[PDB]
Design a protein around this ligand. Structure first.
Ligand SMILES: O=c1cc(N2CCOCC2)oc2c(-c3ccc4c(c3)OCCO4)csc12
Length: 109
């Protein structure tokens, strides 16, 4: 059922926030801050920013109908990072490490 799916989405998001993953998860906790980080082209390139705290807020107000809408936002958060940055940049490697954790749990839901 859609309800149990979304309980499971909250548990996957919860694990993404856990200390175990903080070494590569920490950039994706909060919305990207273009002023504090000096990314003047960011809102030009990324038309739909996404982050873990926003996904948690959307979850906690059921904006997600099912697991697939949740997953689309998670992948959008990773896509933005892949789209915006050189593929060799540190933050891309970190997003990849976190996505491998997400996709494993998402597949086994
Ligand atoms: O796509 C991205 C591109 C980049 N950058 C910045 C540095 O390297 C060059 C370009 O930054 C981010 C971040 C991030 C980075 C640092 C933080 C942060 C968040 O939040 C808490 C304070 O420190 C998250 S996605 C992302």
């Amino acid at each position: 059922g859609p309800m149990e799916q979304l309980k499971c989405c909250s548990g996957i998001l919860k694990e993404m926030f856990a200390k175990k993953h903080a070494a590569y998860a920490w950039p994706f906790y909060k919305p990207v801050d273009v002023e504090a980080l000096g990314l003047h082209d960011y809102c030009d390139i990324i038309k739909h920013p996404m982050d873990m705290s926003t996904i948690k807020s959307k979850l906690e107000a059921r904006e997600y109908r099912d697991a697939q809408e949740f997953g689309a936002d998670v992948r959008l958060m990773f896509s933005n990072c892949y789209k915006y940055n050189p593929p060799d940049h540190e933050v891309v490697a970190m997003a990849r490490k976190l996505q491998d954790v997400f996709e494993m749990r998402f597949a086994k839901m």
